[PDB]
Amino acid sequence: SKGPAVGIDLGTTYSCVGVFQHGKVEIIANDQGNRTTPSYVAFTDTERLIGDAAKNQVAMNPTNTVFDAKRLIGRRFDDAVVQSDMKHWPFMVVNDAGRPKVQVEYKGETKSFYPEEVSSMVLTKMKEIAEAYLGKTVTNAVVTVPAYFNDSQRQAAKDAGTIAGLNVLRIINEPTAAAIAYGLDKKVRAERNVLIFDLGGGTFDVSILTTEDGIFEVKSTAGDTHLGGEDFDNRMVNHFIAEFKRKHKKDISENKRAVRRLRTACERAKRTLSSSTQASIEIDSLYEGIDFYTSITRARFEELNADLFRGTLDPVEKALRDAKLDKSQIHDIVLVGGSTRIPKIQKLLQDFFNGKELNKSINPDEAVAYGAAVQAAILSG
Template identity: 55%
Template sequence: MKVIGIDLGTSNSCVAVYKINQIEIIDNDQGERVTPSWVSFTDDERLIGNVAKLEVSSNFERTLFQIKRLIGRTYDDPMVQADMKLWGFTLINEENKPKISIEHKGRRKILAPEEISAMILESLKTSVEDRLDETITDAVITVPAYFNNTQRNATIDAARIAGLNVLRVINEPTAAAIAYGLEKETNEEQNVLVFDLGGGTFDVTIVKIKNKEFDVKATGGDTHLGGDDFDNCMVNHFVSEFNRKNDCDMSPNKRGINRLRIACENAKKNLSVKKNATVQVDGLHSGIDFKSSITRAKFEDLNRDYFENTLKTVKDTLSSADMNKSEIDKVVLVGGSTRIPKVRELLQNLFGENKINKTVNPDEAVAYGAAALASNISKDELSELRELKISDVVPLSLGYKQSGGGMVTVVKRNTKIPTKQWNKNSTAKDNQIEARFTIYEGERAAAKDNHFLGKFSVKGIPAALRGVEKFKTCFIVDENGILTVTSRNVSTGKENQITFDKSGKLSEGELRRMLEDANRFKQDDAEWKKRSEQVHKLEDLVYAVKHAVTGEMSFDVSDKDKKEIIKICKKVKTWINDNQNPKVHDSKKKMADLEKICRPIFEKIRDGSEILRIFQK
């Protein structure tokens, strides 16, 4: 059975599979190799991909995008609070979890970010199943290198809702490095820096490549930096311009903001090939048309801080790898935002133009690498990728909270995995009979400023003065990134442990409910498709019958019969217009009504059986 590789992106997603000794990027149902990570709900259907993106102007309250920026985050996260001001859909607070509230088929639905991501994943999964004509159950899914444990778990939960078993989660830049390494397979050792700047996240990873061996040296990044932020800068710029020119405040106009965002995104793309771009939105706010322009220089100035931050991350990652820029052989550009001329200029100034690799497709490289790893771990005996070897690193430091609130780092970021790291500590209070260990990940000095993972206790410690009772604490991270923390009381041998696996963090009840909802959406979509196909079949039949008696090559029927056929055709066409996506049996009944009138007429003329065949299709 095939294992697929999926790049679930903030702006766009892509899926690939290894077959017949090559990796193939799979087209979606619209023939596109990349699928916009957008979901839209209309009154009677759910849309995914580019058709959903086209709904944002007219259906902005139910068109969802940038969901990856919500996944695994809390509602009070400052980044969530900032983003939601620019979204058209409604975000609500449910136990400090951000949820999306939409109206669909006359009912209010509350959806978790995992459910929306699952819809995109399911769409990609279906595309592969349609192409290969087989059921897909297993996948390798990529995540930003700087995704924390909760964000990774939430991604896996999304996959489970979509009916996928995640065999491995791999960092996006590592997957891109695999794509580059397989394309440029050589016996010579190369140090490759992957610069991954997509729609919503940014990663830098340094990988040593030789043959099919990929040794990650260091990684760095920002889970909230990408093309969407560049768009937002332009949106804010033009909102200020519009308000100033028209003495108003259009900020609360979410429909207008979303229409402006699409125009800004198009302008951004144009500025990658032109020095000047036009931003035009008719009836932007209060019926007022808006037209302006932006130069490439102005765009670069608006986003200067973002661009400079990417370069700072590059330098920090080089430092973490204990390397200098001269030791980098190639810089691989991944993600659509690497097409921005200023980004390329900064990298060329740092590394030299000859080191910038432009052969890897920035939109498809991550999915390509994920599919290669999928083939490797699927144990396909025919696969040429069985020799693939990947050595990754811990993206964030791991440790525990000490009594004073500081973070005791046990595993430093960019430590190679698998790894086992020990730490010695002791009781913090007199007569303490229980030791509590609170585990965090992150780089801040105070534990509370880092990301909380979990906690556990070792009980039954002999009462003694502070510092007498000793502990040995061990952090183990396996090759899949699964963390296990164990602490043992030296004097008694009593111990306890906690494992942070990748099984997901949704409760079984939440997961069951989301799976049921996902299945319901799938059934609704299938039913809608059947109804749509049947009514289109009826409409085609109406036009075929009408043209058979009114067209240039029409049949020779009497004026009375022609009038009767035109009358029934008009009646059925009016019914189609008045009944949006009617039930299948209703469309079939109208088809029978049409045939009842037409069959006797066509049976009595020469070659009439030719038109009657369409009723059997």
Template identity: 50%
Template sequence: MADKTRKVAIGIDLGTTNSCVAVCKNGKVETIPHKMGGFLVPSWVTYTRKEVLVGDIAKAHGAAYVKSAIFAIKRIIGRKFNDPVVQSAIKTWKFNVLEDSTGVPRIELKHKGDLIRVSPEEISGLILRDLKESAEAYLDESEITDAVITVPAYFNDHQRQATIDAAKIAGLNVLRLINEPTAAAIAYIYDKPEKQKRNILVYDLGGGTFDVSIVNLNNANISVKAACGDTNLGGINFDDRCVEYFMNLIQNKYKVDMKEAHSLKYLMRLRNLVEKAKHDLSTIYETTIELIELHDELDVYEDFLRARFEDLNEDLFTKTLEIVKQCIKEAKLKKEDIDDVVLVGGSTRIPKIEEGLTELFGKAVSKAINQEHGVAHGAAILAANLTENLSKTFNISDVTAMSLGIETLNGEMNVLIKRNSQIPTQAQRTYTTGVEGENAIRITVLEGDSKIASKNLMLGTFDLLDLPLNPSVNVTFEVDCNGILTVHAVEDSTGINKMINVILNKGRLTSNEISLLRKKSYIIKKNNEECNKVKEKKNEFQTYLLKTKDQIKRSARRINTKDYEILLNKIEDGLSWLSTKEAEDVKKIENKYNGIHKYYDDILRNK
């Protein structure tokens, strides 16, 4: 039974391809098994004709519901529709992604006969709710509300805010957003001696994102010195390269265009086969891609060698090593100063990754933590630390991934907080109007590392109006421990002020929208429960019908011929009825069952 004296908080690794949830209780960290089995939950949501599926079962239905099977949504959460990353992702997806009136992406799909639009936050919220429910079932808790959720170190302010919104939709309170490599570092040092000093480089290559962080451990103090990465580089990119290779091969060799509508389900199957082959090639040198009955009874068998896989992705592997070198430089260290290189993320199982890092550092890399579960473990440890459920305490100091500033009149970015500044932090700067006589000032908040303002991400903009002549406006930037920015501006002489949590940025979900989506998520849960009850009843009824049919056939001689024929007809009618729309109601199934069961009982009594 669960210990009810303290509130349980969980750690969640919300991944691009897979997600994971863990807990730290009584000093012990463990990965929580999913309610359907297994520990890694595919980050898939599939809208079927009747219900909304999450995880393994959603992925299994992907080929049947190509247009409504949503995956890798983390790639576009918190981004604008015209973002190059969004446009690149759309090209690889078969579900429809459209731009809404505020310029953000929405997924359009059919569900229960209606054409609906859902947000990336809603999809992520469904995944988070599913993980939450698994934790509640496993830990025997009626409800778990507190969680630490991990995000890529290179997630910007919008992406972090959107992740918090997704958690709210799932009914979760975010104790802390923590960068994925920082969480991995916590997991790595958790069972190490407390009194030690080390520089740890965390190489985190997951399904959709890549992060590198250099973490300094000084006794119980964990301090991130630098973080670099690419939020559009991961295992999915490797898959995309391989899928494209086989699509071209199949078109040239077999004259089948897999981009055509009738081939979409085979394209989904090819993607799944390529993903499996990628995993296999981490331990063997050769595998086979088998597409059975691809077209007009055509079977495709193609060898796939590890060497080919490495050749297709060589430039991406090299790119990760360049980012590693950049991170070491930004931490003002040499590679010889790195004591441990820690691998995390499923894609680090690729042998070429380990080979490249071993060659770069001249020593073996560490696999001391589980590459798929380590990030969730670190989040769980921090959750226990924040809720005082941990005897071993530590202090964490993370950093900003990118610089923060405002746009100046000449179109440049004036930096207030530099990238890799330790958080929480704040900075202040004084500004005035650009033209004499002006009584208003516009403040445009930027995030990025380009000197040219237009090349950075605009987080938000607001105006201070009715200012005196030659105003003196103090602008304060505050970044909290979640890496989220608040901007405050005040004019000295008048006290005119304005605050922006960059929450008000166009395209963000409002608190009312989040509340409605949370209710919708609950309705989906209840609908799924009803669908499962129907499936269970239909299965029970079908089992009863088949069993009864077998019994009366074996005892036909002892049953009146007329009764036998009537009962057999009722059974056949029942089996056919199970395929009708009417059989989607538990009460009607029970009534149908009771009618046949009563008739059979009457026959047995009158024998």
């Protein structure tokens, strides 16, 4: 026997899967052709679309396109963290005897779903993707939950795998995976103090990790659970909403769809802003048939979020305090999280540790997956 054993990075927002076949951990590409998937589950009149095609339909299907599934998993309905977010989603999360589900309308009927199977649904597609490129049925996986996950959330995110059909070997911490990606545990026989800076698409996770000879210990976590990628897009989306409104003197705001088209355009823009210094927002017949055609500077950009971009440096210290370690004591700075591609966030942190070089060679949206797959081979039999 042998069996392809994949490591999956289930995200909050996006999830990436990857395997390591003889020598390299290759990161299973996507049907549309991406190294990701946005963690989106949609129910319409005909079908239930997971992955990308779901995310694309969220304007034209608001009330019945479920997402941010990972924020519910683990908690009971009467929890605080659910009560706050309950006021921020186009769908409905209800209670069923203390436990929550998402109520939506699937193929004309009205059904309800338990977080672990909304999150399972993603795994299922994530499952298929592994099968697509490898050419065989994939049963073994290793999943990533953040450091702040308690048994409740683990036993659920473990359960998303079981229900997906997956036989989950072990279930590990994101920050840890990252450190393993870089082989920071493959060490040189001293003690190790490592730092993880995930800056997701919705979550800012910071961790300071001690490797005491081959083994990790999870030291101190920290961050803003509502600061992230989308927020950055919101500042852009909020800006152009203004520039256009003032260019024509016609406000778009309360137009659910006009809003989204710009949205996805600001996203596209922001990403290239990490290499190029100029973005180009090009949306045809946006609103009242008017076209929108403009640009945004990388300069202009960094100043839009500047208040937020800058502020992240704060938890770095804050963990480092609880961690009972000085800036210097860290032997590794690992840039995990997609958003860490923004060069403004990069230098801010690189300056913060005073010139130190940053561990950023692997694509900050994959990284947590890379190890997930690696830690798998070891566990693979």
